[PDB]
Copies of this chain bind each other. A is one copy, B any other.
Amino acid sequence: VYPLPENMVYRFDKSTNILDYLSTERDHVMMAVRYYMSKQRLDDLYRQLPTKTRSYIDIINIYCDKVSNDYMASTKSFTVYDINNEVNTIMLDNKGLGVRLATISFITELGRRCMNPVKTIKMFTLLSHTICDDCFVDYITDIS
């Protein structure tokens, strides 16, 4: 509230939201276990990727990291399904590279805000299919 910028308190509430999921010691320990497992798995996955896939990851980092540096998801009842379909529709109409990269950043931010890991990775899996249309694949292979 006021003297404080209202946008500011909301941002801080949002940044401390994980704490509502860490109510007991058991919750903390389970989070630690899952993080260890997930982080080891991701580090290992990258270690098995050949340079073709690594260069595609580099391209995504180049554009998504640039924009991000230059400039309902934490709910219990979260509808990735309609967001997916809305995305699919935007992609059939707009054939630019930009909107595809924008979708990647948008979904990534929903993933940051989502406190359910199974839901998060289902979202990533579905939306990566939707984002990788023939148009996106053609851009990525062209500029790599």
Instruction: Write the residues of chain A forming the contact surface with B, with a CB cutoff of 8 angstroms.
Output: 1-5, 8-19, 22, 25-26, 28-42, 44-53, 55-64, 66-67, 70-71, 83, 86-87, 90, 93-94, 96-99, 101-108, 111-112, 117-118, 120-122, 124-125, 127-129, 131-132, 134, 136-137, 139-144
Given that A18-B49, A98-B16 are known contacts, is A32 also in contact with B60, CB under 8 Å in the complex? yes
Chain A contact surface mostly: helix
Copies of the chain in the assembly: 12
User: How many angstroms between the C-alpha atoms of A51 and B139 in the bound complex?
Assistant: 12
User: How many angstroms between the C-alpha atoms of A2 and B36 in the bound complex?
Assistant: 23
Contacts of A129 in B (CB 8 A): 30
Contacts of A42 in B (CB 8 A): 35, 38-39, 42
